[PDB]
Amino acid sequence: EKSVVFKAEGEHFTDQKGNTIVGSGSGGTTKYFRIPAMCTTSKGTIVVFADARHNTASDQSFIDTAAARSTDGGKTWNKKIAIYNDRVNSKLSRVMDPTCIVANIQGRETILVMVGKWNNNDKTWGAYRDKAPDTDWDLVLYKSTDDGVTFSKVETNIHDIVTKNGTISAMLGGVGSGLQLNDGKLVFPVQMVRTKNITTVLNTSFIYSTDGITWSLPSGYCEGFGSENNIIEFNASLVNNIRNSGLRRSFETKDFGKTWTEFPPMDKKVDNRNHGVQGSTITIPSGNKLVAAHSSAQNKNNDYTRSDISLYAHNLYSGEVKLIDDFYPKVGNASGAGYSCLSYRKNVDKETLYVVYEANGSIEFQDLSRHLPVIKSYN
Ligand SMILES: [K+]
Fold first, then answer.
1. How many angstroms is it from 215 CA to the middle of ligand 1?
2. Structural domain range at position 328
3. Annotated catalytic sites, by residue?
4. CA of 95 to the centre of ligand 1 (A)
5. For the chain, what is the domain count?
């Protein structure tokens, strides 16, 4: 049922010159993996990104962005580093927290992956609010136009638009996957730490682009909560689905990011209990209707173990919610647990629904396609 994408203490990567990366797992393996992101192409190719936390599960550690590629439906995986940290600080240099998009960008099928980058900061990003933006921070974007075989840096204006805004200390993608709108626009959900003088520490929003090079921020902000979030497109709205301690939150914007209001079909529908957790939210067509599929943890121990990572369906018309599958019905590792990413496509007449998720320091994959008739009914 499950394949292992990245095995904790079981992978060996090489650096840009071809020398092994000696981590702290047994045998000099990478110690721990976190924060999976999955994007599936029109060829059926699955690409899974994750933090390769070579030494420890801590966010403040030495991390590269690994990529695993499967062309056999998730049975086997070719693994490499997609994004290397800057190798300034052997304890702290890091590229982390991926969000991916698969899109047709002016005709060219592209996988985008966006990650935050730090070097010398020894604390989490909320501790750095004095500058607009933090000098240790960056937000980097890589692309593949060869079906996930090679990734190259994209030169963007993302750092510039954050500086121009003047009230953002640091920004990340929302974690998991972004989207391409029906009209072609590329949209990354984002999370941001505001400068100190702003009363709200965290906000959610999005960045958008036509070409993947020049990006824009909307003028408005959504309340931050636990800030990790995903966006779906539903009629003339963009709708988010945000981490929060307890009940997850969901807002809609009808003016392309100027204002946000609660979205009743998803707001407060799933309980992740203490601390909250990242969750993945996507749409699945059913005739000319849509259903939202969502994954996050039931968290039966009400703590950082984030047990029982589960798939839900949200009826976007009636607001009903139901549990479809508790696909990881296990207590997680409190060093870092609970995260997931869904991926749906219809390629020709073949519909696929896949998930990746955190499993005791490893990243696992499941093919959840057998659940599609149940999800699609929920309209
Ligand atoms: K964190």
1. 25
2. 1-379
3. 59, 339, 358
4. 13
5. 1
